[PDB]
Symmetry: D2
Subunit: 444 residues, 4 copies
Amino acid sequence: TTILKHLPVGQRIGIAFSGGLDTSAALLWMRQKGAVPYAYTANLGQPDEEDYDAIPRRAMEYGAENARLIDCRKQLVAEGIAAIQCGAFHNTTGGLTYFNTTPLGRAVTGTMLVAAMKEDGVNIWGDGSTYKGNDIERFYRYGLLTNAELQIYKPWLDTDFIDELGGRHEMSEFMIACGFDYKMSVEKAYSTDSNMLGATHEAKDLEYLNSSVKIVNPIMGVKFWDESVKIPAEEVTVRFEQGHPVALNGKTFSDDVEMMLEANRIGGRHGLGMSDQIENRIIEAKSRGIYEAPGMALLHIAYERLLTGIHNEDTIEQYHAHGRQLGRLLYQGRWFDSQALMLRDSLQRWVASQITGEVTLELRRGNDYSILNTVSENLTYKPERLTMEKGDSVFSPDDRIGQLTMRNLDITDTREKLFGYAKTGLLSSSAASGVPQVENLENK
Amino acid sequence: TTILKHLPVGQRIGIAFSGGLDTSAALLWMRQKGAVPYAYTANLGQPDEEDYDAIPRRAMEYGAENARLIDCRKQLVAEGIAAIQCGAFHNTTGGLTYFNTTPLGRAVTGTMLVAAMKEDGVNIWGDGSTYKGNDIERFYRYGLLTNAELQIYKPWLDTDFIDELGGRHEMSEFMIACGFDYKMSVEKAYSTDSNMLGATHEAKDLEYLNSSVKIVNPIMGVKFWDESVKIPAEEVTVRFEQGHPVALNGKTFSDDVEMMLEANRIGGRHGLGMSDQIENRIIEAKSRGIYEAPGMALLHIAYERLLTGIHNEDTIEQYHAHGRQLGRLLYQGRWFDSQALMLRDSLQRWVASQITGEVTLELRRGNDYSILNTVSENLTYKPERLTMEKGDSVFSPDDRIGQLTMRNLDITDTREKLFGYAKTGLLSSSAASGVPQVENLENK
Amino acid sequence: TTILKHLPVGQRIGIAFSGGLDTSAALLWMRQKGAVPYAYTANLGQPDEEDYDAIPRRAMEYGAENARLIDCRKQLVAEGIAAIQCGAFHNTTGGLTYFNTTPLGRAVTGTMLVAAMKEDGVNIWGDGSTYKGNDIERFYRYGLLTNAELQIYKPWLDTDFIDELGGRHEMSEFMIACGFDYKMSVEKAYSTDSNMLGATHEAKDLEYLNSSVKIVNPIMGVKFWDESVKIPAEEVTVRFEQGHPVALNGKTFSDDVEMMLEANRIGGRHGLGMSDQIENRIIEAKSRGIYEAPGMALLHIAYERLLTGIHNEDTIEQYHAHGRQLGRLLYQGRWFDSQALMLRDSLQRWVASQITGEVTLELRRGNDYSILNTVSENLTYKPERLTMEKGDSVFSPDDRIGQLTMRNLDITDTREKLFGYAKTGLLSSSAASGVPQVENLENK
Amino acid sequence: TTILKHLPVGQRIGIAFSGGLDTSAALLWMRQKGAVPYAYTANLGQPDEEDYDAIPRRAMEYGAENARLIDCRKQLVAEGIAAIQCGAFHNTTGGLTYFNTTPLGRAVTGTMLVAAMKEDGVNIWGDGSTYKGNDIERFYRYGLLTNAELQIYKPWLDTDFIDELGGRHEMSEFMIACGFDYKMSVEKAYSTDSNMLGATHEAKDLEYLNSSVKIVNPIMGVKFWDESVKIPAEEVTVRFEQGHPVALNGKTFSDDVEMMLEANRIGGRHGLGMSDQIENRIIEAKSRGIYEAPGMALLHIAYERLLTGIHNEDTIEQYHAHGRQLGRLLYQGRWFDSQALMLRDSLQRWVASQITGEVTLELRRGNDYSILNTVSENLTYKPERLTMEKGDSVFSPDDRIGQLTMRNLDITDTREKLFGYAKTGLLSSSAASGVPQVENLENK
């Protein structure tokens, strides 16, 4: 059996230990009931975390056999950069994009923490991810891809667990009954999950479509919708070498994690990258979220502007189509499946490899920015190529006339189709007024 | 022969008469050389045109046999609304979109003015569209689809024409030599083409990638990048009935043209919808443009937000894929070809028909706005459906466990593929650190 | 609760009564245990059924409250024709195709029999479809789409049912213990499911990949692989009007069911349309089947040959892409979902509507046939259009030279990309020998 | 200027010297008029060529400065194998496929012969490919990608050439007037172009759709449609290692050219792989051809059968979609463009790399064959996985019930859409009879 519904007494069980009430109470309870819990805390460069080292120590205090801090920043940023290179984003509204930051975080922690558990002889993961979300499924696959012998204990399937730690208040009472003066965090009107690529806000009041970003206190940027917050316009340069982001404002970095942290600071000052999406969950039901990803947004804008100046139309269209499809697979927890790897590897090799260049932007408030300059030794755009100024052209007016004439047979075929569609009722006429009129409900 | 290189003396020739120097000098010249020109001016609701009635009168004064004002506003707005319903936009940069406003305008005028010419027994169109642009090709097909017997005279293929009206100065001198005290318009640092769906700015200084929107004086909106321009935040509501935009700020309109003019006013106050694109022309070479489309942008944002709250994932993905493909066909001048009609009709019938609802936005500067509310009697998003509050769920925790178990065989297959790809060199390992590592250049 | 695990005593329960041992024993058992079963038999024009009227009478004899014969032939053939018009087939191997005949049959019976049950005040369906197949899921959705109040009783979830009717032998013993001298059918080396569109053979010895079509006794055609079976070559004509198949061998029919029965006879004489597929089930695991669909294959060949002579390339490619996607949705039981309806309606309206014409074939053995003639008043293929004979061409040699020159800028860009890819290691060189060499494992 | 319309007197000009009347007369004429022609003959393993060495000697006799035999077999077969691995075939009719053998041949010779010319200081190619075909465009790009300084002389643009060598008879008379007792080949009712991957037959009587394969004398196989030709059934095995075809009938080869020649012999004995296609040319007008490719067909069937037993559904669908798109690019002469390389490299790396296995077939006549066995150490199909025999399953009946329940919310949404579409007129009803009825012309 892969899924365990009862606490495996006397056995080693791993817990992805965040340090919050849920994992603190669960770890203490698992130790108290006879299991041997091992805690693993992922360093994800969370914007609202200032003391990762204190977390494993809290796990030991609550009963962990051993507690480790697993650094996942390097891997997280590497996958985030791959996602930018592939345009692996599928939830967009009016062009505004969610950068799939939670899905990227899960691909990294679901594999890395289970690998750390395996290394320690821990083959059971006590994962509390809930039954209505996407993470329960993402963690299930990533964990099993990493350890074929993995078993997953879902505490909420254990009646003994539910009877004692059924909610926040029960858990708080439990900690106190166990001798720990636990202090709960201040309640918010929504729930937040974050990593150094982005933050997601959902649930509670954000379940209502008449709530908006205004109820959120951003953790990676400023409240740009508040007129009293001063945000001076700022010029910023983003430079890539073979698809890899290497410099911001003319400066290079010791590693990609430092680069991403600076991208976040720059975008954050403006509130760049925030969006509000209604999305389709893996289970085919909709949820709503508010998102932040300042650095990812900054890199995305510059990367796409260079793409438009370097690649041909067929290639750009394959980037958009394959990237969206890849974004959906990423969201589904299938980032390492063959159908995703084949799209990601393709886009990195043939599209991203040629993205060498620099884009200059002026950032103002929120998503309001302007492109100021675009340069690249690989540009196929050239000011002289299609200019009507001066002269000297690769093709002549007579050449274009020949190209137009080559369209004649197909134009005749299309006209004949218009007559055919009018005869079969799909068009009112192939003309009337001149413009063909399609016969459907939207034709007023 | 379809294309004529010599002025057809003694024959009727139609001219799409804009009223500018080029069409004024060409019409006068064609009359002077023995042809019988007929002028057709399209009323396109251009933002920078205040006196359409004066244009046909100027055509008569310069030599037109007859001059007509053909109203194309109703048809233009109908096609613009269809484009919104279909998401028929393919040039996007970092999510910012060009609304294909010139391609829509050409589909309407290329067919309507040629139909008006045919009605008057005019079977030759003297069209000066240039040899390096997209319009020469769009007009060629739309014209021939409308009139199988159409011939197109390209003045720039006529050496006599070039010898006399080779440039702006030659044309100006010609008007004066012909007895007309012609007054040229003030020169700008770029060229503009517009209609009531949008304005495009290109050429001259905009050919350089280090020029930006700041050199443009917007004609449909304000200079939002200028801090001295005051733009108060504004709440706006956009309501649709079966995919059709029917109310703005709770008010309905006498017709769709009035609706679009109000959408433009609202978005215009904020500079909503402006973008800067490097695009691929039909001839496979790149050009650069600055675009305005305030009303189209406002409707697009609201339409997509409703789409995300109403349709399932497969359907939304077909809207994005088919809409982009349709946008490319529209740009190519193939809006009435079978491959475009089949996508447009499909999206209107099955996607747009269910878009009944209202979206509330707060518009600030440029593209910076926030979504404040989303309502629809057709929403499939419901706050109660996936909430962890209260209780009562359509599926249980045990149900989700079963769904996860059904993934086991495919998860095993994927793990086996990871081992297989590591063996064949595509992955460093199926793990190392835990995260599979793809073997390509972007892997640092 | 939608799914019921216990027999609903005293309530009306509908059974899709095939007349075999499984449904005979289940109906008798349900009556014996206190339920009130209503039997519904679908007339699907099964090739191996000679007495549909006897079935409802057998249901009454075994305990049915009422038993009805629901004719589904007209609807089945209508959906089969729609599938041909849309090329809604996704499981192909080396070009050989499975015509999704079981998925079409389920869409029709899942909706029609539940509608018949609802009409009779029966809101519970006792459906034995098994837990490992595709049908359990197809019937579940089609049933619930038709009756929102439907509950589905799965007998195999009832321990009392399993204890008594656990297998074929137990069921046979049960019938006898209940007073019925039941005579089981002769056992075969595989299982068969059929309707007038096609027959599927799977399970038992067909689970082994070293078994082949040779172990199957075809029920819609002859054993064409057996040299001793004589099959004279046969000329056949298939004619369509606006996408609808109307004549075979110059003869018309009283209705589409008669047409399809004749198509099956013609193809059947040759064994046309048989295939062997390894396919992916809805649950993401593979199964193997042997298939027959003589009439569907005959119509498919003629329809596609006309498509190639009538439609442009973009349109043909949309037919292939959208048709495959639609085939997958059909297989998933999503034939009536928005994402499927939008593809099916599109293809019927814009692709099928223009398919008017006739194709002549010579059928020999199995899939070996030749196309002998293709005619259509809508052909865009014309022998004179691209012939090098005589003369008179719509475009001239000079015109083609101009069209070639228009490719120059993009050719330069591609060459530059080849140099760029060689520099970044994706190509060995942009040349070596002359042919660019891609750097991957398949490059020997 | 890239294209030359006049013979470049005193300059070196390369000719792709086939040895037929056209290239013999053209080379002699070019020498006679003052140019310095260099002949290049591609060894393409043509099925109807028995003496390649005699060709360069004939070129010298007619006036070549130097004449070389360039072996292109290794490169041709490498690209043919890549095409099989990628399913790069887009012209299919009823599942029957054209294997893009001419497009593959042109990609290889267009680059290799121009590279050979460049190596010899020859920067002008006298290429007679005609103005109405696809090759003029394929050769133009492949040549210019290989040599940026290439100029192409089209003899048919030279009036002096046309005046003297306007047709077959004029050319024959020319050879004789120049002192060569030239003997023309026997005339056929169609034209043929071939290489070791396949042969194409077109033009003359094949321009008429009432002509058929029966007028063709196959050059790579037998006349399988002729009952008097005896073709015994034959068992054949095809084995792949990591996507590469390595053994036929249990035997390996010294190189891939020998392997392909044996594949051709095996398929040829049966006439496997012949098809008749109406296709869309690059210029958007249709042509008709008869095709042969026995070896390619044999490898394609085995490769796809293994694909279906090894890869998941998303991956197989990407293979079909990306492969067709790649086939169209190959046909267009864009095999080395970024948009093609990105699809080809992707499919080779992630799809083909896992195709290790062996398929056994029984070949009979033409396309009539049966699959007899399928084996692979990489199969994800397993007879035990979904069998209802014995027991022991990875998922239980209860697990499937949970998976079904997870569909409930989306099923409700779809039902609601059916009601919505009936209300807006797209469906007659969400039911009537039970089956939803789409409101379009094909609904009888």
